[PDB]
Motif scaffolding. Sequence first.
Motif, PDB file in Angstrom:
ATOM      1  N   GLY B  48       0.781  -1.155  -0.043  1.00  0.00           N
ATOM      2  CA  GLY B  48       0.051   0.101   0.068  1.00  0.00           C
ATOM      3  C   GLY B  48       0.960   1.453   0.105  1.00  0.00           C
ATOM      4  N   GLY B  49       1.935   1.162   0.501  1.00  0.00           N
ATOM      5  CA  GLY B  49       2.904   2.473   0.463  1.00  0.00           C
ATOM      6  C   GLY B  49       3.362   2.810  -1.055  1.00  0.00           C
ATOM      7  N   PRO B  50       3.937   3.668  -1.045  1.00  0.00           N
ATOM      8  CA  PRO B  50       4.457   4.582  -2.514  1.00  0.00           C
ATOM      9  C   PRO B  50       5.905   3.953  -3.037  1.00  0.00           C
ATOM     10  N   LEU B  51       5.665   4.265  -4.286  1.00  0.00           N
ATOM     11  CA  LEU B  51       6.825   3.966  -5.086  1.00  0.00           C
ATOM     12  C   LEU B  51       7.022   5.176  -5.671  1.00  0.00           C
ATOM     13  N   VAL B  52       7.656   6.178  -5.390  1.00  0.00           N
ATOM     14  CA  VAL B  52       7.950   7.727  -5.944  1.00  0.00           C
ATOM     15  C   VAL B  52       9.262   7.734  -6.728  1.00  0.00           C
ATOM     16  N   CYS B  53       9.280   8.497  -7.719  1.00  0.00           N
ATOM     17  CA  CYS B  53      10.251   8.986  -8.865  1.00  0.00           C
ATOM     18  C   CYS B  53      10.346  10.366  -8.746  1.00  0.00           C
ATOM     19  N   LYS B  54      11.415  10.821  -8.523  1.00  0.00           N
ATOM     20  CA  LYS B  54      11.864  12.174  -8.393  1.00  0.00           C
ATOM     21  C   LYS B  54      12.416  12.802  -9.908  1.00  0.00           C
ATOM     22  N   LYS B  55      11.795  14.055 -10.073  1.00  0.00           N
ATOM     23  CA  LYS B  55      12.198  14.947 -11.261  1.00  0.00           C
ATOM     24  C   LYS B  55      11.921  16.254 -10.959  1.00  0.00           C
ATOM     25  N   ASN B  56      13.212  17.096 -11.156  1.00  0.00           N
ATOM     26  CA  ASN B  56      13.137  18.481 -11.028  1.00  0.00           C
ATOM     27  C   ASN B  56      12.602  18.740  -9.468  1.00  0.00           C
ATOM     28  N   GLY B  57      13.142  18.057  -8.681  1.00  0.00           N
ATOM     29  CA  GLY B  57      12.930  18.190  -6.977  1.00  0.00           C
ATOM     30  C   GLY B  57      11.477  17.784  -6.412  1.00  0.00           C
ATOM     31  N   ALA B  58      10.585  17.157  -7.622  1.00  0.00           N
ATOM     32  CA  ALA B  58       9.458  16.740  -7.142  1.00  0.00           C
ATOM     33  C   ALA B  58       9.279  15.355  -7.208  1.00  0.00           C
ATOM     34  N   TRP B  59       8.630  14.756  -6.116  1.00  0.00           N
ATOM     35  CA  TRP B  59       8.285  13.311  -6.223  1.00  0.00           C
ATOM     36  C   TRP B  59       6.651  12.865  -6.608  1.00  0.00           C
ATOM     37  N   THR B  60       6.870  11.750  -7.530  1.00  0.00           N
ATOM     38  CA  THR B  60       5.392  11.624  -8.219  1.00  0.00           C
ATOM     39  C   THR B  60       5.318  10.061  -7.984  1.00  0.00           C
TER      40      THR B  60
ATOM     41  N   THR C 102       5.943  17.806   8.229  1.00  0.00           N
ATOM     42  CA  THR C 102       6.093  16.403   8.506  1.00  0.00           C
ATOM     43  C   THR C 102       5.075  15.709   7.580  1.00  0.00           C
ATOM     44  N   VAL C 103       3.840  16.317   7.230  1.00  0.00           N
ATOM     45  CA  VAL C 103       2.689  15.855   6.503  1.00  0.00           C
ATOM     46  C   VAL C 103       2.396  16.490   5.407  1.00  0.00           C
ATOM     47  N   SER C 104       2.420  16.178   4.402  1.00  0.00           N
ATOM     48  CA  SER C 104       2.090  16.949   2.848  1.00  0.00           C
ATOM     49  C   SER C 104       1.785  15.926   1.767  1.00  0.00           C
ATOM     50  N   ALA C 105       1.276  16.458   0.687  1.00  0.00           N
ATOM     51  CA  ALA C 105       0.979  15.471  -0.292  1.00  0.00           C
ATOM     52  C   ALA C 105       1.998  15.058  -1.392  1.00  0.00           C
ATOM     53  N   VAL C 106       1.997  13.750  -1.968  1.00  0.00           N
ATOM     54  CA  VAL C 106       2.694  13.367  -3.078  1.00  0.00           C
ATOM     55  C   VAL C 106       2.005  13.869  -4.315  1.00  0.00           C
ATOM     56  N   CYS C 107       2.943  13.847  -5.450  1.00  0.00           N
ATOM     57  CA  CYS C 107       1.962  14.190  -6.716  1.00  0.00           C
ATOM     58  C   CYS C 107       1.716  12.927  -7.420  1.00  0.00           C
ATOM     59  N   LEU C 108       0.521  13.184  -8.341  1.00  0.00           N
ATOM     60  CA  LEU C 108       0.136  11.899  -9.005  1.00  0.00           C
ATOM     61  C   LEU C 108       0.185  12.367 -10.516  1.00  0.00           C
TER      62      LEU C 108
END
Lengths: 10, 97, 131
Positions: B48-60, C102-108
């Motif tokens: 259920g947790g995330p698999l995030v990829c960073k691009k230009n300082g932001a995680w998607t 410590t609490v915020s959103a991830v991007c979709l």
Amino acid sequence: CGVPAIQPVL
Amino acid sequence: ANTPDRLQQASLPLLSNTNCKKYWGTKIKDAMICAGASGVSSCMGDSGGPLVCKKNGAWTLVGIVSWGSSTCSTSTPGVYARVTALVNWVQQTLAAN
Amino acid sequence: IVNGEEAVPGSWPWQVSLQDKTGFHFCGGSLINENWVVTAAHCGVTTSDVVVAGEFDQGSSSEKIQKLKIAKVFKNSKYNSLTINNDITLLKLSTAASFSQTVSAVCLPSASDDFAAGTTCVTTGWGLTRY
Ligand SMILES: CC(=O)N[C@@H](Cc1ccccc1)C(O)(O)C(F)(F)F
Ligand SMILES: *[C@](=O)([C]([C]C1=[C][C]=[C][C]=[C]1)[N]C([C])=O)C(F)(F)F
């Protein structure tokens, strides 16, 4: 969205 | 087995579904994306947790921890829910509620 | 995560812990905004479970976490539990989370976004570190 205030360090 | 008290993290590479099928065969569907088989592995409780990829300082959010090796083998790719295949549904559900 | 490493406290602000009424962590989740959490459908979440935001050390009592109640569980109708396909569920919170350091959103991503094989990403969680 997507920019942590506390930067992760890998 | 060992369960950590503190949050863990791990960097790992995305695989192609075609390549992943070399490990999982027909279990791999379009709405899945594989990652790992790199010396690390998601495991029970990561679900259920995330698999995030960073691009230009932001995680998607590219994937959601789904399933994989019954023994969490680090040489086998983990399988995650492919968010690009599910985001339209996410946007719709939010907009409607 | 097997062979991972401890994260910097609070550096994955969207990471939430799904715990049952006994406080047992059974799944992870990601905040996409103040009122919604995205998780896996196979986590079998019900409104009796809770979303915990702002946590790092689950063995610590000194963290200012937010234990949020779940108002509704939206399991994607496309979800197939036998093939574990379209494994996604949305959780609508009864009360909005309070965003902070410590609490915020991830991007979709956009449905048409391309994430190439070979791209290095990161996964986080409190799953087993040793099977
Ligand atoms: C109550 C419990 O099982 N642990 C909590 C933390 C905790 C740990 C040790 C003593 C008190 C509280 C927690 O993780 O559910 C939190 F969400 F409330 F943070
Ligand atoms: C979930 O944490 C696990 C996560 C996982 C295990 C093994 C390899 C990759 C990912 N998923 C399953 C289906 O066991 C949980 F279900 F255990 F909660």
